[PDB]
Design a protein around this ligand. Structure first.
Ligand SMILES: CC(C)(COP(=O)(O)OP(=O)(O)OC[C@H]1O[C@@H](n2cnc3c(N)ncnc32)[C@H](O)[C@@H]1OP(=O)(O)O)[C@@H](O)C(=O)NCCC(=O)NCCS
Ligand SMILES: CNC(=O)[C@H](CC1CCN(C(=O)c2cc(C(C)(C)C)nn2C)CC1)NC(=O)[C@@H]1CCCC(=O)N1
Length: 150
């Protein structure tokens, strides 16, 4: 019942709308412009052909490593706990497994987001650091850095 589809100029506004409702951070036009250029690293999640979630990633070269950074991964509150997040996370883990050159996968999780910590730890991600004052306009401003070694 869960399918992932490509993000394109035809459905970018559906992605923008989904992110605006799901996430407490507003993303600029450069984020959505970058999204169209990452290809398979950005997907829309459909539940019975209804857009209910999305995943946006970027490649990062830091710590003298090739790293996959998940910027956004989420779905609408009434559709949670159906396997939509797992399908998006498995898709990104599958890109990395096929590619073979990624050292790790990391992301930021606002410290109050207990269900996201639970979700990522279930997949082998670890809290490797807690960045103080990561967010600027939202409370709490601290974010855990979650990382899975590949
Ligand atoms: C975190 C999130 C992405 C998970 O999406 P989801 O579609 O509900 O996840 P799944 O149905 O694939 O859940 C998989 C497993 O994660 C764990 N988990 C997920 N939500 C949980 C919760 N609220 N409490 C406890 N465990 C939870 C469970 O073990 C679950 O397995 P189960 O449902 O078989 O028990 C989702 O809650 C979400 O969209 N959150 C808001 C977005 C956000 O702020 N995330 C920031 C990260 S970028
Ligand atoms: C305020 N930060 C965020 O919203 C981030 C995403 C944000 C996107 C834009 N952006 C970049 O494009 C970026 C990243 C990098 C790396 C790290 C690779 C060097 N380089 N660039 C240019 C910065 C990061 N996501 C979270 O915090 C998630 C979602 C919100 C809820 C939550 O709990 N967690």
């Amino acid at each position: 019942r869960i399918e992932l589809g490509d993000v394109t100029p035809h459905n970018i506004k559906q992605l923008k709308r989904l992110n605006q409702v799901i996430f407490p951070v507003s993303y600029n036009d450069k984020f959505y412009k970058d999204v169209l250029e990452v290809g398979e690293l950005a997907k829309l999640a459909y539940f019975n052909d209804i857009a209910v979630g999305a995943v946006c990633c970027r490649v990062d070269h830091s710590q003298n490593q090739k790293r996959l950074y998940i910027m956004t991964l989420g779905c609408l509150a009434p559709y949670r706990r159906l396997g939509i997040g797992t399908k998006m996370l498995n898709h990104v883990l599958n890109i990395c497994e096929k590619d073979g050159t990624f050292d790790n996968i990391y992301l930021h999780v606002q410290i109050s987001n207990e269900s996201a910590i639970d979700f990522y730890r279930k997949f082998g991600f670890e809290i490797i650091e807690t960045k103080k004052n990561y967010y600027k306009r939202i409370e709490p401003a601290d974010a855990h850095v979650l990382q899975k070694n590949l």
